[PDB]
């Protein structure tokens, strides 16, 4: 089973990603995770964190070159996915193909069942082989909860992603909260 | 050995390619030849290419997007680029990194002293570690003869006049001032012969 961990940054997703994970393990299943974008991890992600840095000039002005730097570290992970979704019971994924669908239409000021989030399902699913996850986990939080713990873009970005979980956008969606308890969830996606 | 053959588009470097092959493989010199942007062998490529005919939203809007596909489709590239230079005594490239170099700074209207250019030298020579050709030769054409020949569809580039004219004159200060090694630049009836004897 695929699972992709979405949301705004300071959302959780990273801290629900090891409740959901220790739940699964208690469950009785092997769980493997891995993060995008994959820093360190390949070139596409480093300029792309770079350009959003103030680096390689008029780079990050474009939407949809930012998206497609993204796409292709996802691309290069392929293999890494194939191989844990061979080896383990569930991967889970902190972050997927939806937060370029989420970020792109939002800067596009877009809207779920926009031009952006319809052009990354036929570039990342598609054409790159992106393995459609099984569930996608949008751990929504409100601007004003997210801003405790750029806020229009953030803002918006919130708004795509709440729409693209109620249109089923790439598969089943399934929101929670913080504070979801790790073994119904567990429970839920099983 | 590895030399890079660069020039404007419609320049006639396909053609180059080939004469100087053959001159190569004459002289009893094994020679291997890639063109770049890979088209069908990189992703990176083929969505460069449909980006500049239009595609893919805002893409083809950005000089370093752009830039930065190509640099991404070569470094894809480096361990074949590698294996040519192991298997035969000549690579020839059709287009490298200067050809990035050049359009850049183009679409830019900066020169050969501009940050693209250093730029796109840190990126793909430094950081992405491309393999610096022995050889670049620009092979200089007339912009009329070689928009005609292009005229004869055509990507954002390639029906931009001026991109193409000041590609051509940042072109001719690289290849002046040596960026990224040893250039020659020729003209559209050069002498095979004569050049491969030159180049090996
Ligand atoms: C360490 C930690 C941070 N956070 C906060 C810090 C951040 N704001 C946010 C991190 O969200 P992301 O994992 O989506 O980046 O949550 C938690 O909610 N729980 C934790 O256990
Ligand atoms: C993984 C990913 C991140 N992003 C964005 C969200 C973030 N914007 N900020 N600030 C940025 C970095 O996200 P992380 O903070 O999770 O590394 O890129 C996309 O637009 N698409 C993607 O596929
Ligand atoms: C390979 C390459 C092509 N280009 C441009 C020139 C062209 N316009 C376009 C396609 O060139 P070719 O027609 O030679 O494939 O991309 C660059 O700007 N940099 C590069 O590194």
Known sequence: ?????????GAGKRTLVEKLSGAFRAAGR????????????????????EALHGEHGDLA????????????????????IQG???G?????????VASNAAYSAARL??????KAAAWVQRIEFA?????????????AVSAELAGERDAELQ?????????????????????????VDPGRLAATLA
Request: net charge negative; with cysteine; hydrophobic share 50%.
């Open 1 to 9: 089973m695929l699972i992709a961990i979405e949301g705004v940054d």
């Open 127 to 139: 054409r790159l082989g992106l393995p459609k996850p099984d569930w996608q986990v949008l751990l």
């Open 84 to 86: 844990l979704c061979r």
């Open 109 to 114: 000021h877009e809207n779920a069942a926009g």
């Open 155 to 179: 803002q918006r970005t919130g708004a795509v992603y709440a729409e693209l979980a109620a249109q089923g956008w790439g598969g089943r969606w399934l929101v929670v909260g913080a504070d």
């Open 30 to 49: 092997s769980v493997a995770t891995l993060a995008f974008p994959r820093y360190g991890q390949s070139v596409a992600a480093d300029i792309a964190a």
């Open 88 to 96: 383990y019971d569930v991967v889970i994924l902190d972050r997927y």
């Open 61 to 80: 002005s474009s939407v949809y070159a930012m998206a497609t730097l993204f796409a292709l570290d996802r691309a290069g992970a392929v293999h890494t």
